[PDB]
Symmetry: C6
């Protein structure tokens, strides 16, 4: 990553074994459950494009997913090139990043450091991270196991467990249905609650 | 988080994998037992709003709870806007944070750093943390399993185990009842103790 | 905690996840065995009152104990107020800490930092830690399982195992009895040893 | 490794136990699955040739592989010597690295530091790392268990699991075949999709 | 401990949770096997007397041992007082440490820091550590399970396993006997070896 | 160890609990398999003689081995004395290290720091480490379980597994035999390969 040092200057630091291992095990244990996205974002804090590629490439499984992510990345890089075309460079001068440069495939670590620490800085790490998260959200939605239409409170299911399933599914797929899909008893209670009830009030009512 | 460096200046540091993992596993293992609140508070020491959202969003389960927390957060943000309305910004000048800015949803990391390190500083991280803890306390109370009225010393239950259950329940729900709910033998001893007895004296008496 | 930095100035640092986890697991595994006291003291090295409350409040069990500790703390705070009464503050000036300020319940983190780093410093963290350890010693003594009078060497118990139990119990409860409570054979050997024998000499004699 | 310090100067730091252990366990658990290559690259961030030899030599198993890697390394060193022949050195002056110097077998740590921190720097660590990764890719390909021709969707295999196997195998071996090797039902769906379908569209179609 | 900082000045640092846990688990797993002594010495690198007492006091078991250690410590403190008697102190001046001061029982942390960082420094941490290791060696010898006279090579015991037991026992208790206690076959081989044989030569001979 | 600080000066740092534990567990798990040597070398990066003795002495088992290592060390120290005899020292001046000084048995930590940070520096840590590794290689060879002559490919053993055993054994003991010891089928294939075949080509041929 790029991080600030005691002297107050942005400098490159090696990605730590703890971060690498953390990402790899997150993916191993959670697959593409939605909460893996914020974790990724936090673990790639300050990441260069090289670091983002390191994190993605250290994943051993889910290679269908990783190829889909390559597709998204290439699409976003093509659009970047459409918006920001690039014009031999002047001796010793910063060149303009193209899509494959932001994705870290045609740019060196040193060039990425130069862009990210330029004044004004070109945050190629954050732009690339945005593309990656776009692709990852596509994957989260794709691997969502169940439709919100199929989450219905069981006849003996505590209302809390049902709401947990409901908003877990809703998060993967990225509230009147909540009442509609409740079971008869709770549905009666919630119908009686009236309009404008908070989720807190509903969960207390069916407790 | 924002933390002080050797030069004595407040600077942003990436949230560490150890902190993220610690929060996630705390929630996995303890759910919303009351002691999870102080842990959260300590793990979010120095947190920006972005960091607080990272911690909350990396939780994969308890999505009913997390939605309730969103409700509380939005309520507090609305009140903040009621008290501190906001007035294009002057070029290069700090803008005033609104509720969604303090919650980290309409503000950037850089803006949050600027507020938190301004002189005088606007501690958006601490204000947001306060809202979050308010919501979390609502959740702790909601998920409290048992009423203090139903904690009664068993006929063979050591007094210590009963007091542990009593104050654990009291903490979740957020002392004469202690004697009232004791079993006959201990209740006789404690009645004989007289008024003004410390908990120490009561636990020794029924030991 | 408050710790010294490279510049040689006392500054506040966030309590680390390793320390929090260490305390919580210490309590989980050892309950109030006496050795938990020194561990606490070491883990709270440099602690502000806020940090001490964090450590105590992250304990989920033993809530009878924690309430007793609150009682001790309040007693010590009352005595502090008896000895050091407090007299609106002068603009921008340090106010005098009262008992609840030292216990971290009516004082802010910033005020605690100011006291602890003042010249001369008011070590509210160490004063509070003293009160906490007083209460904790009360708890260790209370939860001591056995009286030293009931520790007696078994007819086939190695003398070493008996001495281990004897001084473990003595430590919880906070040497001629050692001979008295030894078994007949070892008791004969130790009686023959004569007066003034070191524990080493006694353990070798009955080896 | 060589890393930047607060003063802004490149200095040598000892390889950490966490990095060593991480590499050793990566190899123990994953053998030469392709994702071990990026992990290696990240764990050897900033590595001197000495550090690279340390990482390779701490591997206890797979000694056939490690010998093959020695062969590749020696080949690349021979080519380096072919391109950059070396000409007693001038007193106190930097000598020119030869192949065995870049591989860390005839050069000292101090010489490697001098090359890597020279202005202009001679990045012997990165050149050597390139040779090592070339050999390692040869090994990944060699130990690839299955030909892409033998990855065919099972009659009841979810399309996702089949694509995962397909691109895992393709990665080890280093898309119309994807349709060709799909099972009859999915193959019909994908044939109907028409040309130009993204992998996302194909996986949704056969979901 | 006391350690050097970037400014080059000796300053006090809190004992780390990793060190505390390491010592406690070392004792839990190895009891007083001889190798626990060097580990202690290394874990108490730079330790103040307070730190040494922390390490000793966090041990929950082996309280016979810990009392014996108190006896040794008090003996050494008495001798220190015999050699270095102490003479109200001059205002603001360093006082002379007595035995109980070096053992950390009548001296404050601040006084210990002052002694250890004085010019010339009075290394109370190292003196105390010496006393502690003296007592600990007494304990290692006491808890040694077996006499070297009773270590004899079994009729089918590999010579290596026998030598391992022999020097393990010798280390606890703190070479012609090696041949004498070997079994008949190996004893014949070693007798034939002649005088002046290295342990290497003996182990190869009986391999 | 001795390591460079931010100010750019070589200073002593305490050996870390992670390094100590790493060495101890390496030895516990791998005994004297050859790969333990590079690990040792890396874990003792920057080590003083005191640190090397700490690492060796914290090993609880393999005391035959450790005594043999003492023998090697003493031999090398005797040779050092033969080559570099030593001549009361001049007040305040650096004395010349003798063999037992380099082995850390007659020299203090402070003297070792002085030698290792002198200009020119006397690298007693590296000289001693060399002696230690010489002894350790003797031990690796001694504890090698099998002769290379006894490694022969099984009639159903994959060629890869056989080469792994072959070069593992060769490494412990410190290529035409490879063909000679292969099984009949693979031996025919490799004989047909002709002269000059790389190990890669041989392993592919018998795959
Ligand atoms: O490999 P790293 O990511 O750099 O981890 C280190 C390491 O922590 P762990 O070994 O516990 O992961 C240090 O531990 P030491 O062995 O040096 O003691 C610790 O320093 P502390 O001893 O002060 O805990 C430091 O933590 P800190 O950030 O508080 O300096 C932490 O670095 P990260 O926190 O960046 O992981």
């Amino acid at each position: 990553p790029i991080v600030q040092n005691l002297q107050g200057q942005m400098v490159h630091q090696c990605i730590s074994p703890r971060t690498l291992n953390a990402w790899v095990k997150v993916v191993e244990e959670k697959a593409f459950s939605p909460e893996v996205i914020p974790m990724f974002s936090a673990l790639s804090c300050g990441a260069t494009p090289q670091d983002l590629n390191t994190m993605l490439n250290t994943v051993g499984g889910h290679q269908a997913a990783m190829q889909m992510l390559k597709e998204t990345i290439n699409e976003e890089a093509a659009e970047w090139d459409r918006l920001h075309p690039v014009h031999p460079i002047a001796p010793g001068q910063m060149r303009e990043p193209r899509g494959s440069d932001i994705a870290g495939t045609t740019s060196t670590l040193q060039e990425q450091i130069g862009w990210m620490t330029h004044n004004p800085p070109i945050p190629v790490g954050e732009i690339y991270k945005r593309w990656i998260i776009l692709g990852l959200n596509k994957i989260v939605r794709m691997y969502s196991p169940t439709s919100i239409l199929d989450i219905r409170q069981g006849p003996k299911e505590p209302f809390r467990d049902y709401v947990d399933r409901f908003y877990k599914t809703l998060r993967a797929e990225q509230e009147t249905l909540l009442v509609q899909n409740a079971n008869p008893d709770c549905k009666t209670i919630l119908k009686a609650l009236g309009p404008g009830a908070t989720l807190e009030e509903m969960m207390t009512a069916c407790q």
